[PDB]
């Protein structure tokens, strides 16, 4: 991969692997989400990050995902080459945004798009905060200054408010636990695992007859390595579902989300 | 990736990804196992498969792993390029063997090696069978004829018989269940998930202070999508060795047995 000519975005090509695909021989949404993370990490490395900035390391601050929104038009098949372009933008004092565009390397057409909202947090107390001027200055140099949105449309699915699922849920998958492969290099549960857990409560018949077109996920709290999660789903409708991940015991919310599925 | 000059082996280079590494910023054994399977799949595709032969498709037969043996000297770091060479060999009527050699692309040194034993099975009845001459002639043209072993040593760990762990186990991890990401393109549990489940019963302090050097796994039965597994471990030993057992949480039916060897960091 490499930064583009202006140095304000990053591109990388990936060849879809045999273990990365599902029953239709196309990449799962989790493989797509892993690739978005990888191109994001490669972009941060290319522009000098060790994405904590110098000031963030001094004030013990980290970026945490608040929301992830993905829309897939075509899932790349096993052996296909997908090109992903990524960029970040400052959202004033609120936080930052990272966007992605997925393209078929052979045809050049857009096969998917994603957007994510990140907020600042003290890594020890876990308390959220706004973005200060000193931190905004050291990352503005890597962002386009004029707006560049993967989801430009005025009133699109990426900015919709998600309600809290009420008991009883129509479907559920209980007792979900992360294993070591679900952890990142800092021993935290990878954000992609939560996408997997959300999908676990969708019945197999829907998965077998539909393709996931849109997924919006809100992140409220982290699941620790010794935590146990319940995944809850209710049909709200194409089929649309409302989702909720909560701790098995006290019922503490960890995530909420929505999915939109198209008939094959 | 590509077949080598003689067309009897296959090589592929991989750049280690951010999500593929553990706490030390080096590839986990599961990432290594996934890469071994990807290079194996790319080798089968390059020589005309889609590794079911023409006669195998006619007799409804498939290759199934009986044993996997991996030895790692150095785990590649995040961003490093690892080159993996793979080849297959006929083992007469018993089955076939697939071997791998892992190398650091920059230094050229061997950083790991793996070997695996595969047996023929009827896809529907699940009954094992020997390799017929007709099937053997369809894949011998893709194998070196003279022996080529990743583990040549006359008394090596890859061919050791593994005993069955006796209750009570020293350590355990109960109620393990596969999710959709643990399934392959045919909706079967991926073989690499079993490596993960075996490792789950190793205490975190051993993982934090040791590096996994050798893993040998015997595959006895498949875990179905609605099955629940218990992972059991007992220390058998600067080096720590463990005996492992995966069994169904209910009836206690054996699915895998294995051994691991760990070295102090
Ligand atoms: C605290 C937290 C969040 C924030 C952004 N969600 S919240 C509480 O603001 O709704 C995301 N992950 N974690 C661990
Ligand atoms: C049935 C099976 C085996 C065989 C080789 N083990 S066995 C029958 O010899 O105990 C390996 N994986 N699976 C699913």
CATH number of the domain encompassing residue A202: 3.10.129.10
Mutate to test the pocket of ligand 1, among A116, A128, A161, A189 (most ligand atoms within 8 A of CB): A128
Looking at all shown ligands, the one closest to residue A256's CA atom is 1
Q: Where are the beta strands (DSSP E) in B19-127?
A: 61-72, 81-90, 96-104, 110-122
Of A183, A192, A199, the CB nearest to B180: A199
- Radius of gyration for the alpha carbons in chain B, expressed in angstroms and rounded: 18
Helix count and strand count (H, E) for chain A:
5, 12
**Helix-strand-coil percent breakdown of chain B, rounded to 5?**
20, 40, 40
What residues of chain A lie within 8 A of the CB of B176, using their CB? Answer: 177, 179
Distance from the Cα of A56 to chain B's closest Cα (Å) equals 21
Q: Where are the beta strands (DSSP E) in chain B?
A: 2-3, 10-15, 61-72, 81-90, 96-104, 110-122, 128-129, 171-176, 210-219, 229-235, 239-248, 254-264
End position of a domain, from candidates A159, A179, A199 = A159
**Cα angle B260, B262, B265; round to 5:** 160
Distance from the Cα of B155 to chain A's closest Cα (Å) equals 33
What residues of chain B lie within 8 A of the CB of A185, using their CB? Answer: 18, 21-23, 25, 78
Assess if residue A165 is contained within a domain.
Answer: no
**Region for A67 from its dihedrals, namely left if φ exceeds 0, alpha if ψ lies in -120 to 50, beta otherwise:** beta
Of A17, A183, A200, the CB nearest to B179: A200
Give me B74's structure tokens.
Answer: 């150095």
CA distance B112 to B32: 9
Helix H or strand E segment including A234: strand A229-235
Is the backbone peptide bond immediately before A83 cis, with ω within 30 degrees of 0? no
Assess if residue A166 is contained within a domain.
Answer: no
- Cβ of A220 less than 6 Å from ligand 1: yes
Give me A250's structure tokens.
Answer: 């006290």
Together in a domain, A127 and A229: no
B185 close to A (CB below 8 A): yes
CA distance A88 to A113: 14
Domain that holds residue B69: 2-150
CA distance B178 to A190: 17
Of the CA atoms within 13 Å of residue B97, those in its CB half-sphere come to 20
User: Cα A263 from chain centroid?
Assistant: 24
Supply the DSSP string of A141-169, one letter for each residue: TTS-SS---SS-STT-GGG---PPPPSSP
Q: Angle between the A191-200 and A29-46 helix axes, to the nearest 10 degrees?
A: 170
Residues framing ligand 2 (Cβ under 6 A): B 64, 66, 119, 128, 219-222
Resolution in A: 1.9
User: Cα B204 from chain centroid?
Assistant: 23
A30 close to B (CB below 8 A): yes
Give me B77's structure tokens.
Answer: 């770091």
Of B28, B180, B184, the CB nearest to A19: B184
Residue that has been written with the tokens 């876990």 in this structure: A126
CB A115, CB A101: distance < 8 Å: no
How would you class A193 by CB atoms within 10 Å of its CB: exposed for 0-12, middle for 13-18, buried for 19 or more? buried
CA distance B260 to B263: 10
Least Cα distance to A15 among A99, A105, A102 occurs for A105
Best to test chain A binding among B16, B26, B28, B179 (most A CBs inside 10 Å): B179
Segment 78-97 of chain A within 8 Å of chain B by CB: 78-79
Assess if residue A164 is contained within a domain.
Answer: no
Together in a domain, A151 and A195: no
Q: Is A108 helix (H, G, I), strand (E, B) or coil?
A: coil
Least Cα distance to A258 among A153, A155, A117, A160 occurs for A160
Helix H or strand E segment including A36: helix A29-46
Residue that has been written with the tokens 């009133």 in this structure: A155
When divided into structural domains, chain B yields a total of 2
Q: Where are the beta strands (DSSP E) in B73-182?
A: 81-90, 96-104, 110-122, 128-129, 171-176
Assess if residue B211 is contained within a domain.
Answer: yes
Q: Which residues of B are catalytic?
A: 186, 188, 223
| B254 CA to centre of ligand 2 in angstroms | 10
Contact B180 A190 (CB under 8 A): no
End position of a domain, from candidates A136, A159, A182 = A159
How was this structure determined? It was done by X-ray
How would you class B25 by CB atoms within 10 Å of its CB: exposed for 0-12, middle for 13-18, buried for 19 or more? middle
Assess if residue B159 is contained within a domain.
Answer: no
Q: Which letter does DSSP use for residue B27 in this model?
A: B
Distances (CA, A) of A171 to A237, A248, B238: 15, 15, 50
Handedness of CA A131, A134, A136, A138 (dihedral sign): negative
Together in a domain, B89 and B195: no
Assess if residue B133 is contained within a domain.
Answer: yes
Together in a domain, B216 and B144: no
Best to test chain B binding among A18, A28, A36, A81 (most B CBs inside 10 Å): A18
- Cβ of A8 less than 6 Å from ligand 1: no
Together in a domain, B136 and B39: yes
Q: Angle between the B191-200 and B29-46 helix axes, to the nearest 10 degrees?
A: 170
End position of a domain, from candidates A128, A159, A190 = A159
Residue that has been written with the tokens 């583009």 in this structure: A4
CA distance B67 to B69: 7
Assess if residue B237 is contained within a domain.
Answer: yes
Of A30, A186, A187, the CB nearest to B181: A30
């Amino acid at each position: 991969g490499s930064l583009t000519e202006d140095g304000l975005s990053y591109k990388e090509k990936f060849v879809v692997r045999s273990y990365e695909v599902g029953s239709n021989k196309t990449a799962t949404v989790e493989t797509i989400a892993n690739l978005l993370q990888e191109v994001g990490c490669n972009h941060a490395q290319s522009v000098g990050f060790s994405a904590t900035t110098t000031t963030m390391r001094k004030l013990h601050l980290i970026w945490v995902t608040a929301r992830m929104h993905i829309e897939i038009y075509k899932y790349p098949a096993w052996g296909d080459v997908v090109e992903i372009e990524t960029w970040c933008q400052s959202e004033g004092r609120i936080g930052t945004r990272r966007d992605w565009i997925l393209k078929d390397s052979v045809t050049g057409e857009v096969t998917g798009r994603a957007t994510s909202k990140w907020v600042m947090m003290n890594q020890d107390t876990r308390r959220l905060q706004k973005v200060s001027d000193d931190v905004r200055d050291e990352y503005l140099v890597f962002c386009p200054q004029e707006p560049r949105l993967a989801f430009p449309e005025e009133n699109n699915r990426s900015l919709k408010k998600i309600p809290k699922l009420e008991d009883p849920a129509q479907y559920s998958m209980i007792g979900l636990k992360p294993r070591r492969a679900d952890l990142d290099m800092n021993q935290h549960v990878n954000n992609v695992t939560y996408i997997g857990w959300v999908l676990e409560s969708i019945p197999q018949e829907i998965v077998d007859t539909h393709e996931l077109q849109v997924i919006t996920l809100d992140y409220r709290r982290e699941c620790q390595q010794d935590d146990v999660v319940d995944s809850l789903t209710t049909t709200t409708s194409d089929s649309q579902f409302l989702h909720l991940l909560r701790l098995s015991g006290d019922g503490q919310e960890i995530n909420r989300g929505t999915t939109l599925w198209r008939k094959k």
